[PDB]
Every structure is written in C-alpha cells, then in structure tokens.
Design an enzyme around this catalytic site. Structure first.
Site, PDB file in Angstrom:
ATOM      1  N   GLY B  25      34.080  -7.514  40.729  1.00 15.91           N
ATOM      2  CA  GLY B  25      35.413  -7.791  40.163  1.00 15.91           C
ATOM      3  C   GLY B  25      36.372  -8.276  41.233  1.00 15.91           C
ATOM      4  O   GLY B  25      35.925  -8.995  42.145  1.00 15.91           O
ATOM      5  N   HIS B 106      39.011   5.220  45.823  1.00 15.01           N
ATOM      6  CA  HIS B 106      40.091   6.227  45.623  1.00 15.01           C
ATOM      7  C   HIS B 106      39.487   7.515  45.048  1.00 15.01           C
ATOM      8  O   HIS B 106      38.294   7.501  44.700  1.00 15.01           O
ATOM      9  CB  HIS B 106      41.251   5.663  44.783  1.00 15.01           C
ATOM     10  N   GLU B 224      68.068 -12.740  37.312  1.00 15.08           N
ATOM     11  CA  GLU B 224      68.690 -12.059  38.483  1.00 15.08           C
ATOM     12  C   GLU B 224      68.103 -10.654  38.650  1.00 15.08           C
ATOM     13  O   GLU B 224      67.928 -10.225  39.811  1.00 15.08           O
ATOM     14  CB  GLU B 224      70.212 -11.989  38.334  1.00 15.08           C
TER      15      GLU B 224
HETATM   16  N1  LIG Z   1      30.616   0.032  31.816  1.00 19.63           N
HETATM   17  C1  LIG Z   1      30.301  -0.613  32.934  1.00 19.63           C
HETATM   18  N2  LIG Z   1      29.170  -0.266  33.587  1.00 19.63           N
HETATM   19  C2  LIG Z   1      28.859  -0.916  34.714  1.00 19.63           C
HETATM   20  N3  LIG Z   1      29.513  -1.896  35.327  1.00 19.63           N
HETATM   21  C3  LIG Z   1      30.631  -2.219  34.660  1.00 19.63           C
HETATM   22  C4  LIG Z   1      31.082  -1.642  33.491  1.00 19.63           C
HETATM   23  N4  LIG Z   1      32.271  -2.230  33.090  1.00 19.63           N
HETATM   24  C5  LIG Z   1      32.512  -3.131  34.006  1.00 19.63           C
HETATM   25  N5  LIG Z   1      31.558  -3.178  34.988  1.00 19.63           N
HETATM   26  C6  LIG Z   1      31.539  -4.066  36.143  1.00 19.63           C
HETATM   27  O1  LIG Z   1      32.626  -3.732  36.975  1.00 19.63           O
HETATM   28  C7  LIG Z   1      33.342  -4.927  37.373  1.00 19.63           C
HETATM   29  C8  LIG Z   1      34.667  -4.948  36.655  1.00 19.63           C
HETATM   30  O2  LIG Z   1      35.717  -5.301  37.581  1.00 19.63           O
HETATM   31  P1  LIG Z   1      37.212  -5.285  37.020  1.00 19.63           P
HETATM   32  O3  LIG Z   1      37.182  -4.997  35.560  1.00 19.63           O
HETATM   33  O4  LIG Z   1      37.930  -6.503  37.493  1.00 19.63           O
HETATM   34  O5  LIG Z   1      37.801  -4.003  37.775  1.00 19.63           O
HETATM   35  P2  LIG Z   1      37.843  -3.589  39.329  1.00 19.63           P
HETATM   36  O6  LIG Z   1      39.056  -4.270  39.901  1.00 19.63           O
HETATM   37  O7  LIG Z   1      37.950  -2.090  39.368  1.00 19.63           O
HETATM   38  O8  LIG Z   1      36.561  -4.096  39.922  1.00 19.63           O
HETATM   39  C9  LIG Z   1      32.387  -6.075  37.038  1.00 19.63           C
HETATM   40  O9  LIG Z   1      31.440  -6.272  38.078  1.00 19.63           O
HETATM   41  C10 LIG Z   1      31.690  -5.540  35.789  1.00 19.63           C
HETATM   42  O10 LIG Z   1      30.441  -6.155  35.560  1.00 19.63           O
END
Ligand SMILES: Nc1ncnc2c1ncn2[C@@H]1O[C@H](COP(=O)(O)OP(=O)(O)O)[C@@H](O)[C@H]1O
Ligand SMILES: Nc1ncnc2c1ncn2[C@@H]1O[C@H](COP(=O)(O)OP(=O)(O)O)[C@@H](O)[C@H]1O
Lengths: 325, 325
Positions: B25, B106, B224
């Site tokens: 992400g 965190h 503003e």
């Molecule tokens: N339920 C889940 N199980 C496993 N991986 C997940 C799940 N939901 C999202 N992900 C993965 O986590 C990431 C999501 O990143 P994002 O939603 O932008 O949040 P963050 O900023 O915490 O990474 C992606 O790689 C996605 O594939």
C-alpha cells in the site's frame, strides 16, 4: 459571485507596457520572477539595501522607487504596510504617470488611508491567498495561487483588464481570481490572525499539557500534537478535499470511529462568542485603537510577549525536540 | 531519553539477510522502495489483488505472504491492523524462520493482542511519525522520517541492532529514532484522532460559521479558515521552528500584536477537562468498548456520520469553492 480564470483574462493589456515592482522581499521577488517569465517588461524600484543588490544580481532593471514609478504604466506596491504612506506621498503620487495603475496585495494600506485614489490614475487590490514563495513555486509547477481583487478607482475604464492581465502574468487566474472589497479582505486577514491562529496553538498546547500532566513523554507529546507535521499535512490535504473528507479517505476505521465520536462536540458556546467578540474589536474599531498604542511603545509590550511565549512548556519542549532530531 | 541516529546505527546486521515486506500500500511501497535503494535484499508478500500486480511490475520479488515469511529473516507487517490477527495466525507464526524478527509500524496490533511474542523469534515496533508517501520523499531528498521503536521480545539478543539497521536502511535514523513503549504510542495516535483532530476542525468550523453569520462571503470565509492552505502551512512551518516563533519571524507587526492579544486566552477550562475525559476513555477502556460496538454494525453508524458531515455548511462551501477554482 464573480471569479475570473485564464480563459476570462488576457495578456494583451500588458503588451508594450512597463510594470514597476516596488520591493524585492518574499512578495516582490516572486511577482518580479513570474512577470519576467510571462514575457512582461518589469522594472524593480527599491531603497539602497541588500534587497536592491539581489534584484540587480538576478538581472532585473533596478533603480530607486521614484525612478521606477516615473518609467512605469502599472506599479505593484509590494513592501510592508508600515512603509506605504511615506513611499506613496514622496515617491508614488508625485511621479505616477497619467492614466497609470497602482496595486496593493491586501486592503490593510487602503483601510488605513496610507494609499488613496489619485485624479486621472487607477487604484486596485490584487491579493494572493498564499503569502510569498508559494506564488513562485505554484507558477513554475504550471499552477497558480488563488487571489481576490477590488477596483478602488477606475478613472481610465481600463483598470479591470490590466489588473487581471497582471493576475494572469503572475499565475493567479489559473486557480481563479474572485471579486471582494479590500475592506472585507483586511477583516478576514485580521480575523485569521486574532481568533483562528491563537485558538489553534492554544488547542495544540492544551493537548500537550494534558499529555505531559498525565506522564506521557514530553518530546513525543509535542511531536504528535504538531512536531510530526501530521496535523500540518491533514490541514493542507483538508484544503484540497475537505477536513472531514481527509478522515474518511485516509483514516483507518479505529481513527474514523474515534474522530466522529467527538466531531462537533469539543467546544462550548464560549468559543463562538469570542469569535464574535474578536470581529466586534475589528469592525467596531477597538483593535485599530489597541494597535496604535503598541506602536507608540515602539512595540515594547509585543517583545515581552515574544520572550514570554518561548518560556511556555510547549516552546521549551520544541527546543528539546529540534536539538535531539 | 534514548534517541539513535545514523552514527549510532549500522547496515551490517542486514548484509546477506532477506527482508520480507507484507503489504504494498502507501506504507508497504515506501519501505520496499527505500530498503531496495539502500542495497537491502527485499521480498514482497501480498494477497492476490491490484497491489500484488504493482509490486511485480516495479521489479520486486513478489509472492503470497506465507512464501515471503518462509524465505525471510526480518518480516515487516505493513497492512491494515484489521488483517494482522488472521495473517499472523495463518501466514506468519507457522512460517516465521527460527531466530527471525517481526516488526509492526505502531502499537495498535500489539495492544489488541493480534500480534504476540513467539518462542525463539524477535518482535518489535518501528513506527514512523509520518504516514506513507512522505517516508519515500524524505528518503530521496537525503532526509528521513522521525520514528519510535520498542523491543517487545528480544529472544535472540540481536533485535535492537537489526531493528535500527531497518530504521537506517529506510532513513528514519537521519531524523532520529527514540525509544517509546508500543502501548503509549497507540494512546498518542488515538488521542491525536479523538481530541486534537476533531477540535481543530470544530474550531475551523466555528470561525467559518461566525464569519458567514456576520455576512462575510462564504467562499472567502472557507478559503481563509483553511482553504488557502495558509493555516496548513503555518502548522507545518510551526513543526520546524515553533508555532509562536512562526508568528514572530514571518508575521507583520499588525499580525503579531493581534495574535499575542488572544494567545493563551481563547479556551475555557472545559476544553482541558475533555482532553482528560478523552484519555480516560482510551486508558480506562471505554473507547475499546465503543469501537467493538461500531464494528458489530459493520461500521453502519460511522457511514451515517460520513454522510452527515458532508451536509454541514463548511463541507457544502468546500464543494462550492473547489468547483469555482
Ligand atoms: N484482509 C486483508 N488481508 C491481507 N492483506 C490485505 C487485506 N486487506 C488489504 N490487504 C493488503 O494491504 C494493503 C492495503 O494498503 P492500504 O489499504 O493502502 O493501507 P496501508 O496504508 O495500511 O498499507 C495492500 O497490499 C492489500 O493487498
Ligand atoms: N521603510 C522602508 N521603506 C521602503 N522600503 C522598505 C522599507 N522597509 C523595507 N523596505 C523594503 O521592502 C522589502 C521588505 O520585504 P520583507 O521585509 O521581506 O516583507 P514583504 O514580504 O512584505 O516584502 C525590501 O525590498 C526592503 O528593501
């Protein structure tokens, strides 16, 4: 509402005309740089100091203020409001070519009466909503700063097109340039400085004190409250998409749930009443009085508040943080 | 206080070691990009989705989470906290190599008990104070994000050096990396989200409403109050030199005088009491309860607050501004 953009403004009114930029500070240098890059013939008027030497060294046609006004069709007065009255009376008003245009970058100077209409010349406000260096950045990044404008005296009947030609040359038309009275603009500026600005820092401080009083790490307390820049970034991202919308799109569920539990319920009415008390002091004239009194001391009591502020736990902690990082 | 920088950290502990980044992400992609640029051997573990395809397309050695953990010495769990418990139990704990290290960004996941110590493996928090993309920017700009760290389980006796080796590889050591318990970090995060964040927007809104109720231009009022980014910039510049120091160094006399007239006198005690009431709700466990209840509705009442927020005069005005500019 009347909001002009690139399509509604033209560079034609500046063709074969000389723009004089009075001052070469953070405001002056930005305007001067953009005008030149937009192909506008620009002169720099400035007093015998460091700022004058910078303008000459960066290639600008630089002289004393009086010379620059005599050799100019549009004059941009971009020095501190403290200097306007004197420069206006001595340099500008005596030398301002017949049918020429004078512009200030906010209404402070016009409300004070330091800058006034002249028979046979145009007078306007063209006030960017971002102060100084961003105006240069936004421009080079293909964008521009939002701005307000007001035609104070249109003795030519050409003021509006020339004002907006400058606005476009500088980049303000890209974002958009709205009509608003110089007087209201002044009251918004003062309101942001007198209610909002103090109230943000007081709130930030309240969060810091409560965390420190509850045995949280002072360096960490300060870092999270504003030191991170995270609170800063949210308020900048908020300006794009909206403050609640930032929490919805960027925030986690635990974050969103927690934010929305206290949104609209953190402040007692007392806050709203002060926001009105502050406006009363600006419209009524009680601040205009307060300010004159400080200036008579030579801003003595201000320099006490400056030094008093740095003793506060928050500013003590800030020094301890910057040193450590 | 214990704060490590580039001089106090080494890249040696990562030499010939494989780092697995779980998630790709805004967090995951930044860590992955910096580690690779710092010469660290990095694998990407991710589920079958768009984010997986991006990692492969940008050259990373990408597989399912379980495969990435099996082929890794240090594992960085950078996905949403909602997914940790499940991924931990199924993918991580069963496949985590003997003497390997698990890191979260965190304490949320550790306090919740979703991530736990494992016999024979190390567990730590390494939490940047800037979320997501800045971590990538700061790094490429020769700088880095400030970070907190906590060694939860040091079963190897090597956790600290490896944690700080990652911290350095990513750039956090440049700014500095302070020691702080994952539990306190979690409570600072939640406090920023539950008291400070709402209270800033409530205050911003109060300023807007008072101006609109007093017949100021709504588009200008909003601009503003935050729309400019001027309030945003002040709070970012404030993080550098201090908030009062921004007014002293950047502000005009009229601005300084006005700011200092109301600094430390905008808030009644009621505000301080809520900041403590909010902490009570986080430490006492009253929020931990509130959150579970929202999640059982599928965050139904949250989606009402989302839609309720956008009806508020401020968010109405914001839409009207962005459209116009
Ligand atoms: N339920 C889940 N199980 C496993 N991986 C997940 C799940 N939901 C999202 N992900 C993965 O986590 C990431 C999501 O990143 P994002 O939603 O932008 O949040 P963050 O900023 O915490 O990474 C992606 O790689 C996605 O594939
Ligand atoms: N009393 C004065 N009379 C005339 N020009 C002045 C006076 N004081 C400052 N200036 C000029 O105004 C500019 C000061 O810019 P600065 O102090 O950064 O503020 P601003 O951002 O409003 O330009 C410089 O060009 C300086 O030479």
């Amino acid at each position: 509402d009347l909001i002009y953009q690139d399509e509604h403004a033209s560079l034609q009114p500046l063709e074969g005309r000389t723009v004089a930029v009075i001052g070469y500070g953070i405001q002056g240098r930005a305007f001067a740089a953009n005008l030149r890059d937009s192909g506008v013939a620009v002169r720099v008027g400035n007093i015998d100091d460091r700022y004058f030497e910078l303008a000459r060294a960066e290639g600008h046609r630089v002289t004393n203020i009086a010379e620059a006004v005599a050799h100019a069709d549009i004059v941009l007065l971009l020095i501190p409001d403290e200097a306007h009255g004197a420069v206006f009376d001595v340099d500008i008003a005596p030398n301002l070519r017949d049918g020429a245009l004078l512009c200030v970058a906010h209404g402070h100077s016009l409300v004070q009466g330091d800058v006034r209409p002249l028979p046979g010349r145009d007078l306007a406000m063209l006030a960017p909503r971002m102060y100084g260096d961003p105006i240069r950045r936004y421009y080079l990044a293909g964008q521009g700063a939002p701005a307000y404008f007001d035609i104070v005296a249109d003795h030519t009947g050409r003021a509006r097109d020339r004002v907006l030609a400058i606005a476009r040359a500088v980049g303000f038309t890209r974002a958009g340039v709205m009509a608003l009275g110089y007087r209201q603009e002044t009251f918004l500026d003062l309101f942001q400085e007198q209610f909002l600005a103090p109230a943000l820092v007081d709130l930030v401080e309240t969060g810091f004190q409560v965390l420190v009083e509850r045995g949280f790490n002072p360096k960490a307390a300060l870092l999270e409250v504003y030191g991170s820049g995270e609170m800063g970034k949210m308020m900048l991202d908020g300006a794009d998409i909206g403050l609640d919308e930032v929490v919805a799109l960027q925030g986690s569920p635990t974050c969103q749930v927690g934010y929305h539990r206290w949104r609209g319920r953190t402040l007692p009415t007392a806050v709203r009443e002060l926001a009105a008390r502050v406006l009363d002091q600006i419209e009524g004239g009680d601040f205009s009085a307060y300010l004159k009194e400080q200036a008579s001391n030579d801003y003595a009591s201000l320099d006490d508040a400056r030094r008093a502020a740095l003793k506060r736990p928050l500013n003590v902690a800030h020094a301890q943080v910057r040193a450590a990082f």
